[PDB]
């Protein structure tokens, strides 16, 4: 009933969804073919799966998500691998021609062909829906389908669905390592659209996941599979209070009204704790003080910018597993008495806490350990301004003498939208400065 | 000489060892929520989508909206 409809757009978003639905199937005990075992069944009136799955006629729990990619490669991999009988055969929506790292190609061209079919499928999923809580939209700022087509989906979902909160998980580009070359152009062009149509934009840095994996999980050669597994664990820890009962239950609207101060600062920072492996976890106590100090430890956030050069505004602590609010609020008190975590002066209390009893689950052979307690830090710091300034530096340095602009102009973009998006993100930076001071 | 396989048929995976592994201790408990009586009431209240016999009062101004012809 607390249904949480999902759209995974782009190759990156499709891989996030491929990890996420594996994790959700394991969490709710759903077999890959779609059915649920009878010895597993704790009664026919179970209702946790209704958030993410719908039971059609015979225990066939189909997932409530739409996979999008203009090139058919990753969705055909989904259709041929493991979770092939789970998804609806038409929900895995694809084109044939790809945008190929081009916001203008994803926005003003062939992306404008399948948008009607894909959000018609969104509309029919929402017609099947009855208690729609929000839209979980997974994409990347790297470029192409996840940059322009995602922005088109934001615009049409916004002025088709009313308030209808839209949480946007995005793979933000790293400071130094990167894959595409026009990726700063795609990021700058996508932010200008997502600013007025998103509600909680969770930026995820690939380099941040990489060094978190190699120092915490002790994985010497991590990869995109581990990246999407960790992101899946975090989004499950976010929307686990809707699926399981808790001592303090937080919903997708309490989260928003306790997170964002003003309706332009909606760019939080996610952080999971613990992200330690089994061998390190078996030798350590892992109490609530340690899982809070791991979250507030500044080499653990998921965008490469330390929060010490910034002021915390809101913190949505989502505790999961066997935790007690007494250890929680003792840890919150000692975090407040810690001087180096400087809260902002107009926010006396800034901790929204949600306790859930359900312990986190692990995939059969990943890198995270089956820990009895975990916590999702959700910062609203001003430290993301450093990442915004780095992308401004990259965009201005490549836009100094009009490099890689003829592609966008040929696809259909005018020459002015680059300047409009630069001015918009500069205004956003001015807003961050005037709210930080 | 075996050929290279897919992504799925690898150790380190998205869909390997998913059938033989089932999370027994974690989610066989009452921690998972049920569809009891007062969630069944909310799910059965969906059958009154805009068919309820509540009509607007004649002492209210928004009455000629629903009675335009008279």
């Amino acid at each position: 009933m607390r249904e949480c409809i999902s759209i995974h757009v782009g190759q990156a978003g499709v891989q996030i969804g491929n990890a996420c639905w594996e994790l959700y199937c394991l969490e709710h005990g759903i077999q890959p073919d779609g059915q649920m075992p009878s010895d597993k069944t704790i009664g026919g009136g179970d209702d946790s799966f209704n958030t993410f799955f719908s039971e059609t006629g015979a225990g066939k729990h189909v997932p409530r998500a739409v996979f999008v990619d203009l090139e058919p490669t990753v969705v055909d991999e989904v259709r041929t691998g493991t979770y092939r009988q789970l998804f609806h055969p038409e929900q895995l929506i694809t084109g044939k021609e790809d945008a190929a790292n081009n916001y203008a190609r994803g926005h003003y061209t062939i992306g404008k062909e399948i948008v009607d079919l894909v959000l018609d499928r969104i509309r029919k999923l929402a017609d099947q829906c009855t208690g729609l809580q929000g839209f979980l939209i997974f994409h990347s700022f790297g470029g192409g389908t996840g940059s322009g087509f995602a922005s088109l989906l934001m615009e049409r979902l916004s002025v088709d669905y009313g308030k209808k909160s839209k949480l946007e998980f995005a793979i933000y580009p790293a400071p130094q390592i990167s894959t595409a070359v026009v990726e700063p152009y795609n990021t700058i062009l996508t932010t200008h659209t997502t600013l007025e149509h998103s509600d909680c934009a969770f930026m995820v840095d690939n380099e941040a996941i990489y060094d978190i994996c190699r120092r915490n999980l002790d994985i010497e050669r991590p990869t995109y599979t581990n990246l999407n597994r960790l992101i899946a664990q975090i989004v499950s820890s976010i929307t686990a209070s809707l699926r399981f009962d808790g001592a303090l239950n937080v919903d997708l609207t309490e989260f928003q009204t306790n997170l964002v101060p003003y309706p332009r600062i909606h760019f939080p920072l996610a952080t999971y704790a613990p992200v330690i492996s089994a061998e390190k976890a078996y030798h350590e106590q892992l109490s609530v003080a340690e899982i809070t100090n791991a979250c507030f430890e500044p080499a653990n956030q998921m965008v490469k910018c330390d929060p010490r050069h910034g002021k915390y505004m809101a913190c949505c602590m989502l505790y999961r597993g066997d935790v007690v609010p007494k250890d929680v609020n003792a840890a919150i008190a000692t975090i407040k008495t810690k001087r180096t975590i400087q809260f902002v002066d107009w926010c006396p209390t800034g901790f929204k806490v949600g306790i859930n009893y359900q312990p986190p689950t692990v995939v059969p052979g990943g890198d995270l350990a089956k820990v009895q307690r975990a916590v999702c830090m959700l910062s609203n710091t001003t430290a993301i301004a450093e990442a915004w300034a780095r992308l401004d530096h990259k965009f201005d340095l490549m836009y100094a003498k009009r490099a890689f602009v003829h592609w966008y102009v040929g696809e259909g973009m005018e020459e002015g939208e680059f300047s409009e998006a630069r001015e918009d993100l500069a205004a956003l930076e001015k807003d961050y400065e005037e709210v930080g001071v | 000489a075996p050929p290279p396989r897919r992504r799925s048929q690898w150790v380190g995976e998205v869909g390997w060892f998913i059938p033989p592994y089932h999370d027994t201790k974690n989610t066989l408990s009452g921690n998972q929520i049920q569809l009891k009586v007062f969630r069944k009431a909310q799910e059965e209240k969906y059958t009154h989508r805009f068919q309820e016999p509540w009509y607007l009062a004649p002492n209210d101004p928004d009455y000629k909206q629903n009675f335009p012809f008279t």
Binding site: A278, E279, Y282, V362, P364, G365, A369, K370 | A1, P2, V11, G12, Y21, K25
Partner: peptide
């Protein structure tokens, strides 16, 4: 305690699987 021991056994079985695949690919190379 039983949960942690079962988890460690699962990790050991996975690591045995990667040892098996790497020795298989070594025999493939030879």
């Amino acid at each position: 305690q039983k949960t942690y021991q079962e988890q460690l056994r699962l990790k050991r079985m996975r690591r045995q699987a990667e040892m098996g695949e790497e020795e298989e690919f070594k025999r493939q190379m030879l």
